[PDB]
Design a protein around this ligand. Structure first.
Ligand code: SWA
Ligand code: SWA
Ligand code: ZN
Ligand code: ZN
Lengths: 896, 896
């Protein structure tokens, strides 16, 4: 008799931490799971509960109630708890590429431990969805994803629009990625609360269902209607069975059933039509007014994004590759510790956490977690490096010298001027008064008449090296098999120009021995190497001439300070807000260093800016006035802000490095650095999750009302006209904007606000980011031939050369070694790790281009590869010789 | 003829000179090595795991799949665990904390299936006088410890004059209640047997000394060789070393042993000839430089935080949940265990002492916040659960009921500071601005005055309405979605006396709108109530007259700033250091409030102090110069420091409250507040662990070389001449000193230093405690008749009145109820909780006097008591009617 099937999926959308401290949310999670296990006993008809796609919920429950593991396990075995397949619900754009994979890796592992998994990608609330979601789902064994933002459902009764890229006829779509992967897209057309708090009395039930059924039927491509029975931190509906029974009694034409996503997916498999509308690539709310995309979360609490970048690089690009190589020597690899580090890092990856859009105490807690994960990574990295160095045959170095090993742990050649600190001698305390040992060390340094030099395996001096100084520093060793050993160390501080092949080490040595145009021209205020001529203008901005293309760019590196009367989600400049520019202040130049190899120049600007917003903003936040209606302005009172930017140019390096430093003592404002390119193109390229995504330089004027168009980036953003362009790299600076009049790249360096935003008034004075800041970003001028290299440089430039010391000894390893070969500028390396099951060396690479294929020729000598999925499960598929556009390739290498 | 017990161990400081995770990873290596050596060397007897069960939790957080292996190793005796959870600082943790360490430790040990029957205090900086009672009433007949007892040979005659010298390495330790335990002194430190050699020449050199070192103090033929040290790796070849020792010494029987076997052998052979040590062991008979007592003022913010969480759990969360159980039949055991483990992760000595590096203490702050929020959530729940079940129908429907709780063990008299929600204007589906405008209109229209009423509808005239406002707030219902609203808030102060562990229900209502002499006289500059006349001098110091005894104290409340060129363990005032005094600067008075019930007055002093230490300090720290040799001095450059002290006097309160506020921007200094008493007495009384310990006002002139004598306190310190005295209360201000020439009580408010100290140079810039501070402390003038009341006042004053609102409803509970009776001034209440096994209500009380017995009449209506030990296990013993001197009594109450 019934022609519709109404699926009721009981769920709770459980943001780990948000408007309250984690523990406040945590204790309410205990109540939820408690109510669930109790209801599973009292009401046998209660079908299942969907645990928000995140396995961390189970961990968080057991941390309080570990003795309830068997009851949890049984509930999962019978299907009453529906778990996974992710560990946390991330922000896509603000976590690293690898982090998006490791969320699935760890989630799957947790699911395997429990014995079940929901086969649905879960992005119910994500502030924009990465373009690579289809490939990431498929290659993690998932055929569908559910999401809530950025697609406007148009009626079935209205004719479709082909001009509108981000509209869909039905609540079900076909999502295609840049690599041509396709998945089922499941859109919460009526939000994930459409079936929240179903009534149990007739009159209320009728009013509820008359609306809800019509709202669902309007968008559904099939007879299966999706009713989501929950909301944010919603307690479980304990009388849902009775509510379903009433619904069935009132609407004989509708089959109301307590359901789960797996069953809903299976019913859609039978009845889904062939005319589903297609969505292409990233979904970032392009076709909206642009005021509620929440993209400004990218610049909320930038210090968080910086910490996240620090730890992500540490785990992905230092610790894992080092431990991956050390395995060849130790036959062991720290899986448990790495899992502990990744879990700790990813507790910062739920969207309200990483987005910086929670309360003050939440973000203070994240900082602790960042520190904890980093320390673990850092311990493991130092261990791996010593293990490798200890196995190197270092006997080409005379007894008078102190060997040390440098590592490039990135996937392309690394050319830099390495900044090093080496221990030359150790003066052990033993049983003596430390002051007397200190005096010995001082006396040694005073007797010293020789100069330090660096030598290679063939006894040749590296004349390019520069010794900066010697000093005495307390230090200590912590042996594996005995007590701590304190000592005063003679330390030699030096810089070393070096080019290290991809995934390589080279051993050199420090010794005593006997013992070119500077990059900066002092009379001309000019930095110049083989690639660039950088003139420092009297106002402090830069005129950069590319010495190979010939193109001149004036007025680069402009600092802009604007009011911000918004919140942690959304930036708003006040009415008739005029920018303050640092170049209009007082400018001082300072040479930090200047040689033929490296020059470091400081540009200091002092300019007065408003100290805060005026007294009106406080009244406007307290009353929860929408940010678009606010009449508050910047205060009339001003204070001097001093910006120092250190410019590092290196001799053989096309990438120009900047570090901008200041003490922020001002509230409700935003600081950006600007690079006007004036390049002739209507699009730009941005570093996204496993892709260089093409975006228009103008937002869509049909829909867009926000004067601003902030966008997300990982390591770089770029403009290219077909022959020439500019790549701006960053480190934890995830918000950029393109200013279309001039094609200016604007990088957000600081955003200070005083409140969370969203549903209420939640004061967050710490969101003002008072205190010292230091932001790193770079400029590179590009041609067709260097475009891709500029991309990997911005990526791998985030990772320092690693250094470790060891003595003269026999070893099984060569002094100079490349772990891999066959690198392509167009192929990025993001993972170099080992697999838990059998210790296979897992690599992951992706095509830096969305347009065209390239040759793939990655090779690890002594190893054979086979293709795996993102979760490191072998597939039958054979190793490709080429990457498809936007292909992500994961490989397991086994020692031959 | 001699038996040498080799106990392998590692002294594992959870976090110290490195970040926790750095130590954590090395712990994984320790346990890995142990499990491995259990498999490869069958002769390896056991390993003593530093007396702390947290080690096992920490290991399993990284390697959870190794739980079976751990359990097997524990079952066979190869791992010796517990009996504590952590190794605390005795003095710097709460009284209850010292019990809970054993409670949780026991629970952990019971779960694992074995326990070492030895209290473990290997490195504690001072041992609490109540150690024997605490050990016996926890099922322990012995404690091991390392500090504060000087062993004199059996060759030298035993000196009766020296309280803290022992003839042997074994003592009888006698508590203030006459409890005796076996004291096991590490006479040669817990490293005496570290790194035993495996070669003949080294072994003989080693054992000739070590055996003679032990034989010199051993009362029996049993020699204690502790095979380990701080963070010592396990000695993998110890079996070999023990076999070599046996081949070399036919006269000696070297065995790989454990503490249990060692104690069992001791019980046989111990002579009745052992020295007795009485009370606390704090290194009273040393030079006084290496007591490490100044750990009490290292990073005072930590101690404040610890106090906040300690009061939250002990005196708010548990007392409310214990009562709420009557209604819900449930009590949050798991949540509380989680709260306590989190809190106690901050209780290892190097943690709470603030003698670690900066990152360790940043992590502690997160842990404090986490523990606090769990407790705070549970308290608000319990209060709500109770209030929701009170019969509140006696109040009119146009009124707003609220319940006030006193959760302390005595009568609480204060002026409660309250903020009540009068009306809720819910957001519903409207724009917040419209709803806000409604709330503003209500207040604009409002013509009546707010009043407080009791059950009989009678107005409380002493209540003062301070003001009304609009504030965003929200409710989080148990069974539905969040509910935002704008609340009309009434801010008011309410004088009230609540009996011990009781509640009272009042109500807020509107109604129609004397004869009051204000507490402060603006002409006299005088604060005056029934108890004290407080004259503020022109220099800002205080002249307080006790209106009862007639005694006058001049020049009270002096602020003294001194140099500190020491470290986190030890304070050192530079050579010829001349203190700067706030009264010698610029003084300002500001009235904050002044009524018949309450007066709040602010004394502001602005004075110039040195901004730092001179440049020589840096050199001295770097070279690791001992603090007693440092020639560093305060800098010549000074800055202005502004202290604001808020004095609060209440009409019926004899205790005068102070809150000193300032922004610390100067380094290497100490700030104290002094109370000169000039009382004729040679001893003082300090709040210690379950005791009011008697201490001399003078350090021991025979031994003491340190110009200072800093001591530890919990909630108060007091001077009494036999008829009159002074009690100074504090909140997290755990360091005090008595200045003997004037009998001045000095409370340390700030101690700022730049390094950790101990075995090397570890810079700790955050130990300078830069930023905003707020320190709370109290003054009471006492007589014989009010002495003990001042102690529980200072204890219970740390705990606020709890407030919770509820609507008009029927209910099982009375509107006004006392949960206990039979309170006595001499009897403190420290625990009011429930017991896991059967939800029996657990009370703990102690005698506030070490001298005299007192009547004990504690009674819980509807309940019957039986005596338990500290760990809540029933004994056959019957409920005493008197408390013995310094007795701690734990009771379990069941409903009748
Ligand atoms: O994550 C929370 C919130 C985001 O912070 C902003 C948009 C709405 N979301 C609902 C909550 O789950
Ligand atoms: O706790 C460490 C340290 C203390 O912090 C101070 C002196 C004794 N040391 C032993 C170590 O374990
Ligand atoms: Zn969310
Ligand atoms: Zn220690």
């Amino acid at each position: 008799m019934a022609t519709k099937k109404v699926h009721i999926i009981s769920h709770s959308h459980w943001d780990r931490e948000w408007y309250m401290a984690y523990e406040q949310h945590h204790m309410r999670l205990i109540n939820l799971i408690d109510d669930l296990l109790e209801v599973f006993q009292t009401d046998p008809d209660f079908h299942s509960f969907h645990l928000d796609g995140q396995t961390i919920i189970l961990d968080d429950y057991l941390k309080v109630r570990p003795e309830r593991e068997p009851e949890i396990r049984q509930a999962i075995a019978s299907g009453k708890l529906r778990i996974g397949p992710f560990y946390i619900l991330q922000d896509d754009f603000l976590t690293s590429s690898e982090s998006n994979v490791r969320n699935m890796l760890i989630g799957k592992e947790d699911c395997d431990r429990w014995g079940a998994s929901v086969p649905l990608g879960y992005f119910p609330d994500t502030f924009g969805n990465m373009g690579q979601t289809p490939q990431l789902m498929l290659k993690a064994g998932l055929q569908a994803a559910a999401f809530g933002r950025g697609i406007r459902p148009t009626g079935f009764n209205n004719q479709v629009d082909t001009s509108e890229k981000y509209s869909s006829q039905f609540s079900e779509i076909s999502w295609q990625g840049p690599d041509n992967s396709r998945i089922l897209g499941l859109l919460f057309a009526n939000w994930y609360s459409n079936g929240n708090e179903i009534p149990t009395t007739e009159a209320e039930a009728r009013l509820f269902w008359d609306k809800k059924l019509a709202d669902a039927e309007r968008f559904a491509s099939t007879k299966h209607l999706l009713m989501m029975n929950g909301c944010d931190h919603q307690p479980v509906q304990l009388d849902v069975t009775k509510a379903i029974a009433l619904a069935n009694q009132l609407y004989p034409d509708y089959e109301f059933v307590h359901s789960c996503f797996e069953d809903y997916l299976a019913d859609l498999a039978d009845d889904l039509p062939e005319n589903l509308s297609t969505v292409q690539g990233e979904i970032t709310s392009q076709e909206t007014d642009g005021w509620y995309t929440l993209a400004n979360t990218a610049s909320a609490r930038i210090y968080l994004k910086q910490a996240n970048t620090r730890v992500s690089r540490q785990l992905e690009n230092i610790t894992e590759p080092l431990a991956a190589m050390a395995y060849e020597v130790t036959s062991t690899y720290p899986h448990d510790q790495l899992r502990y580090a990744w879990k700790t890092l990813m507790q910062n990856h739920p969207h309200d956490s990483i987005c910086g859009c929670s309360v003050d105490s939440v973000h203070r807690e994240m900082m602790t977690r960042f520190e904890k994960a980093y320390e673990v990574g850092h311990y493991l990295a130092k261990e791996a490096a010593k293990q490798i160095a200890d196995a190197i045959d270092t006997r080409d170095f005379p007894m008078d010298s102190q060997p040390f090993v440098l590592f490039n742990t990135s996937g392309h050649s690394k050319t830099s001027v390495a900044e090093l600190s080496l221990t030359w001698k150790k003066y052990h305390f033993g049983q003596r008064f430390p002051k007397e040992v200190y005096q010995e060390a001082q006396e040694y340094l005073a007797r010293l008449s020789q100069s330090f030099q660096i030598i290679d395996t063939s006894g040749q001096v590296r004349p390019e090296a520069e010794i900066l100084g010697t000093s005495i520093a307390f230090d200590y060793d912590l042996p594996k098999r005995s007590f701590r050993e304190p000592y005063f160390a003679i330390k030699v501080r030096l810089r070393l120009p070096i080019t290290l092949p991809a995934m390589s080490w080279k051993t050199l040595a420090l010794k005593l021995g006997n013992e070119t145009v500077s990059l900066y021209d002092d009379s001309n205020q000019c930095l110049e190497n083989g690639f660039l001529k950088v003139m420092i203008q009297t106002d402090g901005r830069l005129t950069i001439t590319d010495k190979q293309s010939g193109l001149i760019y004036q007025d680069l590196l402009r600092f802009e300070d604007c009011g911000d009367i918004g919140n942690e989600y959304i930036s708003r400049q006040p009415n008739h807000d005029q920018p303050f520019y640092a170049d209009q202040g007082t400018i001082k130049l300072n040479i930090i260093s200047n040689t033929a190899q490296v020059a470091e120049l400081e540009i200091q600007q002092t300019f007065a800016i408003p100290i805060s917003a005026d007294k009106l903003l406080q009244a406007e936040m307290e009353a929860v006035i929408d940010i678009t209606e606010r009449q508050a302005r910047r205060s009339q009172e001003k204070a001097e802000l001093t910006l120092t930017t250190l410019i590092r140019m290196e001799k053989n390096n096309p990438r120009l490095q900047f570090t901008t430093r200041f003490d922020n003592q001002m509230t409700n404002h935003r600081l950006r650095v600007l690079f006007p390119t004036h390049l002739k193109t209507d699009h730009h390229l941005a570093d996204s999750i496993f892709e260089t995504v093409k975006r228009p330089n103008h937002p869509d004027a049909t829909f867009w009302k926000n004067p601003s168009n902030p966008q997300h980036q990982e390591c770089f953003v770029s403009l290219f006209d077909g022959e020439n362009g500019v790549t701006i790299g960053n480190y934890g600076l995830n918000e950029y904007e393109i200013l279309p009049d001039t094609n200016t790249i604007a990088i957000t360096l600081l955003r200070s606000v005083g409140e969370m935003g969203d549903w209420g008034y939640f004061p967050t004075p710490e969101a003002q980011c008072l205190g010292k800041h230091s932001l790193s970003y770079s400029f590179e001028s590009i041609t067709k031939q260097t475009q891709f290299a500029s991309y990997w440089r911005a990526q791998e430039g985030q990772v320092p050369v690693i250094t470790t010391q060891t003595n003269q000894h026999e070893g099984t390893l060569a002094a100079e070694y490349s772990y891999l070969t066959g690198t392509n500028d167009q192929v990025a390396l993001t993972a170099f790790k080992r697999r838990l099951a059998d210790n296979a060396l897992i690599t992951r690479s992706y095509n830096l281009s969305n347009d065209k294929t390239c040759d793939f020729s990655l090779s690890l000598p002594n190893y054979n590869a086979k293709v795996t999925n993102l979760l490191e499960k072998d597939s039958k598929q054979s190793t490709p010789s080429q990457l498809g556009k936007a292909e992500i390739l994961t490989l397991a290498w086994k020692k031959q």
